[PDB]
CSV table of C-alpha atoms in Angstrom, one decimal:
chain,number,residue,atom,x,y,z
D,1,UNK,CA,0.0,0.0,0.0
D,2,UNK,CA,2.1,2.9,1.4
D,3,UNK,CA,4.7,0.4,2.9
D,4,UNK,CA,8.2,1.4,2.0
D,5,UNK,CA,11.6,-0.3,2.2
D,6,UNK,CA,14.0,2.6,1.8
D,7,UNK,CA,14.0,5.8,3.9
D,8,UNK,CA,14.5,9.3,2.6
D,9,UNK,CA,18.0,9.7,4.2
D,10,UNK,CA,18.8,6.4,2.7
D,11,UNK,CA,18.0,7.8,-0.7
D,12,UNK,CA,20.1,10.9,-0.3
D,13,UNK,CA,23.1,8.6,0.7
D,14,UNK,CA,22.7,6.5,-2.4
D,15,UNK,CA,22.4,9.7,-4.5
D,16,UNK,CA,25.5,11.1,-2.8
D,17,UNK,CA,27.2,7.8,-3.3
D,18,UNK,CA,26.4,8.1,-7.1
D,19,UNK,CA,28.0,11.5,-7.2
D,20,UNK,CA,24.8,13.5,-7.3
D,21,UNK,CA,25.1,16.9,-5.8
D,22,UNK,CA,21.4,17.8,-5.5
D,23,UNK,CA,18.1,16.1,-5.7
D,24,UNK,CA,14.5,17.1,-6.5
D,25,UNK,CA,11.9,16.4,-3.8
D,26,UNK,CA,10.1,14.4,-6.6
D,27,UNK,CA,13.1,11.9,-6.7
D,28,UNK,CA,12.0,10.1,-3.5
D,29,UNK,CA,8.7,8.8,-4.9
D,30,UNK,CA,10.4,7.9,-8.2
D,31,UNK,CA,13.3,6.1,-6.5
D,32,UNK,CA,10.9,4.1,-4.3
D,33,UNK,CA,8.7,3.2,-7.3
D,34,UNK,CA,11.7,2.2,-9.3
D,35,UNK,CA,12.8,0.0,-6.3
D,36,UNK,CA,9.3,-1.7,-6.1
D,37,UNK,CA,9.5,-2.7,-9.7
D,38,UNK,CA,13.1,-4.0,-9.6
D,39,UNK,CA,12.2,-6.1,-6.4
D,40,UNK,CA,9.0,-7.4,-8.0
D,41,UNK,CA,10.9,-8.6,-11.2
D,42,UNK,CA,13.5,-10.3,-9.1
D,43,UNK,CA,11.3,-11.9,-6.4
D,44,UNK,CA,8.8,-13.2,-9.0
D,45,UNK,CA,11.6,-14.8,-10.9
D,46,UNK,CA,13.1,-16.1,-7.7
D,47,UNK,CA,9.8,-17.7,-6.7
D,48,UNK,CA,10.1,-19.9,-9.8
D,49,UNK,CA,13.3,-21.6,-8.6
D,50,UNK,CA,11.8,-22.3,-5.1
D,51,UNK,CA,8.3,-23.3,-6.2
D,52,UNK,CA,9.2,-25.4,-9.3
D,53,UNK,CA,12.0,-26.8,-7.3
D,54,UNK,CA,9.5,-27.6,-4.5
D,55,UNK,CA,11.0,-25.8,-1.4
D,56,UNK,CA,9.4,-23.4,1.1
D,57,UNK,CA,12.5,-21.4,2.1
D,58,UNK,CA,14.1,-19.1,-0.5
D,59,UNK,CA,17.9,-19.6,-0.4
D,60,UNK,CA,20.7,-17.1,-0.9
D,61,UNK,CA,21.4,-19.0,-4.2
D,62,UNK,CA,17.7,-18.8,-5.2
D,63,UNK,CA,18.2,-15.0,-5.6
D,64,UNK,CA,21.7,-15.3,-7.1
D,65,UNK,CA,20.5,-17.1,-10.3
D,66,UNK,CA,17.5,-14.8,-10.4
D,67,UNK,CA,20.0,-11.9,-10.4
D,68,UNK,CA,22.2,-13.6,-13.1
D,69,UNK,CA,19.0,-13.6,-15.2
D,70,UNK,CA,18.2,-9.9,-15.0
D,71,UNK,CA,20.8,-8.8,-17.5
D,72,UNK,CA,24.2,-7.4,-16.6
D,73,UNK,CA,25.3,-3.9,-17.5
D,74,UNK,CA,28.9,-3.1,-18.1
D,75,UNK,CA,30.4,0.3,-19.0
D,76,UNK,CA,32.7,-0.7,-21.9
D,77,UNK,CA,33.9,-3.2,-24.4
X,1,UNK,CA,24.9,-1.5,3.1
X,2,UNK,CA,23.5,2.0,3.2
X,3,UNK,CA,19.9,0.8,3.6
X,4,UNK,CA,18.6,-0.3,7.1
X,5,UNK,CA,17.7,-4.0,6.9
X,6,UNK,CA,14.4,-4.1,8.9
X,7,UNK,CA,12.3,-1.8,6.8
X,8,UNK,CA,13.6,-3.3,3.6
X,9,UNK,CA,12.8,-6.7,5.0
X,10,UNK,CA,9.1,-5.7,5.6
X,11,UNK,CA,8.9,-4.4,1.9
X,12,UNK,CA,10.4,-7.7,0.6
X,13,UNK,CA,7.9,-9.8,2.7
X,14,UNK,CA,4.8,-7.7,1.7
X,15,UNK,CA,5.8,-8.1,-2.0
X,16,UNK,CA,6.4,-11.8,-1.3
X,17,UNK,CA,2.8,-12.1,-0.1
X,18,UNK,CA,0.9,-10.5,-3.0
X,19,UNK,CA,2.3,-13.2,-5.3
X,20,UNK,CA,1.5,-16.1,-2.9
X,21,UNK,CA,0.6,-15.7,0.8
X,22,UNK,CA,2.5,-18.9,1.7
X,23,UNK,CA,6.1,-17.9,1.2
X,24,UNK,CA,9.3,-17.6,3.3
X,25,UNK,CA,12.8,-16.2,2.8
X,26,UNK,CA,15.9,-16.2,5.1
X,27,UNK,CA,18.4,-13.8,6.6
X,28,UNK,CA,21.1,-14.3,3.9
X,29,UNK,CA,18.6,-14.3,1.0
X,30,UNK,CA,17.0,-11.0,1.9
X,31,UNK,CA,20.6,-9.6,2.4
X,32,UNK,CA,21.3,-10.6,-1.2
X,33,UNK,CA,18.2,-8.7,-2.4
X,34,UNK,CA,19.4,-5.7,-0.5
X,35,UNK,CA,23.0,-5.8,-1.8
X,36,UNK,CA,21.6,-5.8,-5.4
X,37,UNK,CA,19.0,-3.1,-4.6
X,38,UNK,CA,21.8,-0.8,-3.4
X,39,UNK,CA,24.1,-1.5,-6.3
X,40,UNK,CA,21.2,-1.0,-8.7
X,41,UNK,CA,20.0,2.3,-7.3
X,42,UNK,CA,23.6,3.6,-7.1
X,43,UNK,CA,24.2,2.5,-10.8
X,44,UNK,CA,21.0,4.5,-11.6
X,45,UNK,CA,22.2,7.6,-9.8
X,46,UNK,CA,25.7,7.5,-11.5
X,47,UNK,CA,23.9,7.9,-14.8
X,48,UNK,CA,21.9,10.9,-13.5
X,49,UNK,CA,25.3,12.5,-12.8
X,50,UNK,CA,26.2,12.2,-16.5
X,51,UNK,CA,23.3,14.4,-17.5
X,52,UNK,CA,24.0,17.1,-14.8
X,53,UNK,CA,27.7,17.5,-15.7
X,54,UNK,CA,26.9,17.8,-19.5
X,55,UNK,CA,23.7,19.8,-19.5
X,56,UNK,CA,23.2,22.9,-17.3
X,57,UNK,CA,21.0,21.0,-14.9
X,58,UNK,CA,22.6,20.1,-11.5
X,59,UNK,CA,19.3,19.2,-9.7
X,60,UNK,CA,18.3,15.6,-10.6
X,61,UNK,CA,14.8,14.9,-11.9
X,62,UNK,CA,12.6,11.8,-12.1
X,63,UNK,CA,13.0,12.0,-15.9
X,64,UNK,CA,16.7,11.1,-15.5
X,65,UNK,CA,16.1,8.0,-13.5
X,66,UNK,CA,13.4,6.9,-16.1
X,67,UNK,CA,16.1,7.5,-18.8
X,68,UNK,CA,18.7,5.5,-16.9
X,69,UNK,CA,16.2,2.6,-16.7
X,70,UNK,CA,15.5,2.7,-20.5
X,71,UNK,CA,19.2,2.5,-21.4
X,72,UNK,CA,19.5,-0.7,-19.4
X,73,UNK,CA,16.3,-2.4,-20.7
X,74,UNK,CA,13.8,-3.8,-18.3
X,75,UNK,CA,11.6,-1.0,-19.6
X,76,UNK,CA,12.9,-2.3,-22.9
V,1,UNK,CA,26.9,-20.8,-24.8
V,2,UNK,CA,26.6,-17.2,-26.0
V,3,UNK,CA,27.0,-17.6,-29.7
V,4,UNK,CA,27.5,-13.9,-30.5
V,5,UNK,CA,30.0,-11.6,-28.8
V,6,UNK,CA,30.0,-7.9,-29.5
V,7,UNK,CA,33.6,-6.7,-29.1
V,8,UNK,CA,33.4,-2.9,-29.7
V,9,UNK,CA,31.3,0.0,-31.0
V,10,UNK,CA,32.6,3.3,-32.3
V,11,UNK,CA,30.4,6.4,-32.8
V,12,UNK,CA,31.4,8.3,-36.0
V,13,UNK,CA,30.7,11.8,-37.5
V,14,UNK,CA,30.1,12.8,-33.8
V,15,UNK,CA,29.2,15.5,-32.8
V,16,UNK,CA,27.0,16.6,-35.7
V,17,UNK,CA,23.8,18.4,-36.6
V,18,UNK,CA,20.6,16.8,-35.4
V,19,UNK,CA,19.6,15.9,-39.0
V,20,UNK,CA,22.8,13.8,-39.6
V,21,UNK,CA,22.5,10.1,-39.7
V,22,UNK,CA,23.8,8.0,-36.8
V,23,UNK,CA,26.9,6.0,-37.7
V,24,UNK,CA,28.2,3.2,-35.4
V,25,UNK,CA,31.1,0.9,-36.4
V,26,UNK,CA,30.1,-2.4,-34.8
V,27,UNK,CA,32.6,-5.3,-34.4
V,28,UNK,CA,31.3,-8.7,-33.3
V,29,UNK,CA,32.2,-12.3,-33.4
V,30,UNK,CA,30.4,-15.6,-34.1
V,31,UNK,CA,31.5,-18.9,-32.3
V,32,UNK,CA,29.3,-21.5,-34.1
V,33,UNK,CA,28.0,-20.9,-37.6
V,34,UNK,CA,24.6,-19.2,-37.3
V,35,UNK,CA,21.4,-20.6,-38.9
V,36,UNK,CA,18.5,-18.5,-37.5
V,37,UNK,CA,18.4,-14.7,-38.2
V,38,UNK,CA,20.4,-11.9,-36.6
V,39,UNK,CA,18.7,-8.5,-36.4
V,40,UNK,CA,20.3,-5.2,-35.5
V,41,UNK,CA,18.4,-2.0,-34.8
V,42,UNK,CA,18.8,1.5,-33.6
V,43,UNK,CA,16.1,2.9,-31.3
V,44,UNK,CA,15.8,6.6,-30.5
V,45,UNK,CA,14.1,7.2,-27.2
V,46,UNK,CA,11.9,10.2,-28.2
V,47,UNK,CA,10.6,10.7,-24.6
V,48,UNK,CA,11.5,9.3,-21.2
V,49,UNK,CA,7.8,9.5,-20.3
V,50,UNK,CA,6.9,6.6,-22.4
V,51,UNK,CA,8.0,3.9,-24.7
V,52,UNK,CA,5.3,4.9,-27.2
V,53,UNK,CA,7.7,7.6,-28.6
V,54,UNK,CA,10.5,5.2,-29.5
V,55,UNK,CA,11.4,5.5,-33.1
V,56,UNK,CA,13.1,2.5,-34.6
V,57,UNK,CA,15.4,4.2,-37.0
V,58,UNK,CA,16.7,1.2,-39.0
V,59,UNK,CA,16.9,-2.6,-38.8
V,60,UNK,CA,19.6,-4.7,-40.4
V,61,UNK,CA,18.4,-8.3,-40.8
V,62,UNK,CA,21.4,-10.5,-41.5
V,63,UNK,CA,21.7,-14.3,-42.1
V,64,UNK,CA,23.0,-17.0,-42.1
V,65,UNK,CA,26.1,-15.6,-40.4
V,66,UNK,CA,29.4,-17.3,-41.0
V,67,UNK,CA,31.7,-18.1,-38.0
V,68,UNK,CA,34.5,-15.7,-37.0
V,69,UNK,CA,34.9,-12.0,-36.6
V,70,UNK,CA,32.9,-9.4,-38.7
V,71,UNK,CA,32.5,-5.7,-38.8
V,72,UNK,CA,30.2,-3.2,-40.3
V,73,UNK,CA,29.2,0.5,-40.3
V,74,UNK,CA,25.6,0.7,-39.1
V,75,UNK,CA,24.2,4.0,-40.6
V,76,UNK,CA,20.6,5.1,-39.8
V,77,UNK,CA,18.6,8.3,-40.6
V,78,UNK,CA,17.9,10.8,-37.9
V,79,UNK,CA,14.5,10.5,-36.1
V,80,UNK,CA,11.3,12.3,-37.2
V,81,UNK,CA,10.9,15.4,-35.1
V,82,UNK,CA,7.2,15.6,-35.9
V,83,UNK,CA,7.0,12.8,-33.3
V,84,UNK,CA,9.3,14.1,-30.5
V,85,UNK,CA,7.6,15.8,-27.6
V,86,UNK,CA,8.7,19.5,-27.3
V,87,UNK,CA,9.9,19.3,-23.7
V,88,UNK,CA,12.2,16.4,-24.5
V,89,UNK,CA,13.6,17.7,-27.8
V,90,UNK,CA,16.3,19.8,-26.1
V,91,UNK,CA,18.5,18.2,-23.5
V,92,UNK,CA,19.4,14.6,-22.9
V,93,UNK,CA,17.8,11.4,-24.3
V,94,UNK,CA,19.1,8.0,-25.4
V,95,UNK,CA,19.9,6.1,-28.5
V,96,UNK,CA,20.1,2.2,-28.4
V,97,UNK,CA,21.8,-0.3,-30.5
V,98,UNK,CA,20.0,-3.6,-30.1
V,99,UNK,CA,20.7,-7.2,-31.4
V,100,UNK,CA,18.3,-10.1,-31.7
V,101,UNK,CA,18.7,-13.9,-32.3
V,102,UNK,CA,15.6,-15.8,-33.1
V,103,UNK,CA,13.6,-12.8,-32.0
V,104,UNK,CA,15.2,-12.5,-28.6
V,105,UNK,CA,17.2,-9.4,-27.6
V,106,UNK,CA,20.6,-10.5,-26.2
V,107,UNK,CA,22.6,-7.3,-26.1
V,108,UNK,CA,21.7,-3.6,-25.8
V,109,UNK,CA,24.3,-0.9,-26.3
V,110,UNK,CA,23.0,2.5,-25.1
V,111,UNK,CA,24.3,6.1,-25.2
V,112,UNK,CA,23.1,9.3,-23.7
V,113,UNK,CA,22.6,12.0,-26.4
V,114,UNK,CA,22.6,15.7,-25.6
V,115,UNK,CA,21.0,18.0,-28.1
V,116,UNK,CA,22.0,21.6,-27.6
V,117,UNK,CA,21.7,24.8,-29.7
V,118,UNK,CA,25.0,26.1,-30.9
V,119,UNK,CA,24.2,29.8,-31.1
V,120,UNK,CA,24.3,31.5,-27.6
V,121,UNK,CA,21.0,33.4,-28.4
V,122,UNK,CA,19.3,30.1,-28.9
V,123,UNK,CA,21.1,28.7,-25.9
V,124,UNK,CA,20.0,31.7,-23.8
V,125,UNK,CA,16.5,32.4,-25.2
V,126,UNK,CA,15.6,28.9,-26.3
V,127,UNK,CA,12.6,29.0,-28.8
V,128,UNK,CA,9.2,27.8,-27.7
V,129,UNK,CA,9.1,25.3,-30.5
V,130,UNK,CA,12.4,23.5,-30.9
V,131,UNK,CA,14.3,24.4,-34.2
V,132,UNK,CA,15.8,21.0,-35.0
V,133,UNK,CA,17.7,22.4,-37.9
V,134,UNK,CA,19.8,24.3,-35.3
V,135,UNK,CA,20.2,21.6,-32.8
V,136,UNK,CA,23.6,19.9,-32.5
V,137,UNK,CA,23.6,16.2,-31.5
V,138,UNK,CA,26.4,15.2,-29.1
V,139,UNK,CA,26.4,11.4,-28.3
V,140,UNK,CA,28.3,10.7,-25.1
V,141,UNK,CA,30.5,8.1,-26.8
V,142,UNK,CA,32.8,7.7,-23.8
V,143,UNK,CA,29.9,6.3,-21.6
V,144,UNK,CA,28.3,3.3,-23.2
V,145,UNK,CA,26.0,1.1,-21.2
V,146,UNK,CA,26.3,-2.4,-22.6
V,147,UNK,CA,23.7,-4.8,-21.1
V,148,UNK,CA,23.7,-8.4,-22.0
V,149,UNK,CA,20.7,-10.8,-21.4
V,150,UNK,CA,20.9,-14.6,-21.1
V,151,UNK,CA,18.9,-15.9,-24.0
V,152,UNK,CA,18.3,-19.3,-25.5
V,153,UNK,CA,21.0,-19.8,-28.1
V,154,UNK,CA,19.9,-23.5,-28.6
């Protein structure tokens, strides 16, 4: 609903860590929304490896292969 | 890790439900999710820095995050 | 397992007026001979708001593709401004090079593109309707984002 997983100071820290000097007040909602989607796409795909491989506990490695499946971005050739 | 673990854990679990109510994670799994989430959000913000430095626009806008998603391609 | 490896991309005639064609020198390698098709395309992101304003600028469909290393200059006409939202026309968007095997995207090479006016009057007092014939396109060639996707190469 309105449940969030990252705090506003958390967001400024990550922005700072990315080299961002200043941030619009509108960035908080957008960052969080972006984080909802990312998490959805990963968790959904991770549910596959647990449920079609029969288990009830999602392992560390359940998420790992789910992550390997998301497409990896590099910054050169 | 720059995100506190407990609130993130609640968000992961509430997402976990809406798919299927019966569902469980574990300490080291949810920590993997978080590690990725921080790396991804940071990646996203490094891109927004590329605009700012090249245009005349130091204050970052939702547009720029949207853009940084499109280049990667799970808006695709 | 990944049958096609993209080694390098070079952006050419850059910077340049907006109306100039894009020109990328792509170098890539095949490992097995290729049977099914290989499709390259350039997408111009018209607007960050929505995918509906993507313009697919060209598409090279190539096959069957012999094994080894190949190279080509992928030229493609500039986008149709008729379709770009005003607010987005000036400033930064994104071009994409994309490659598909058996209809599955396996690599996406993306660049930020900054369109600026050259004349300081236009820079200072930017017109209400963008004058594309006076926009210069600067592709940030030093900051590619290469994203690979695991695909079925079967």
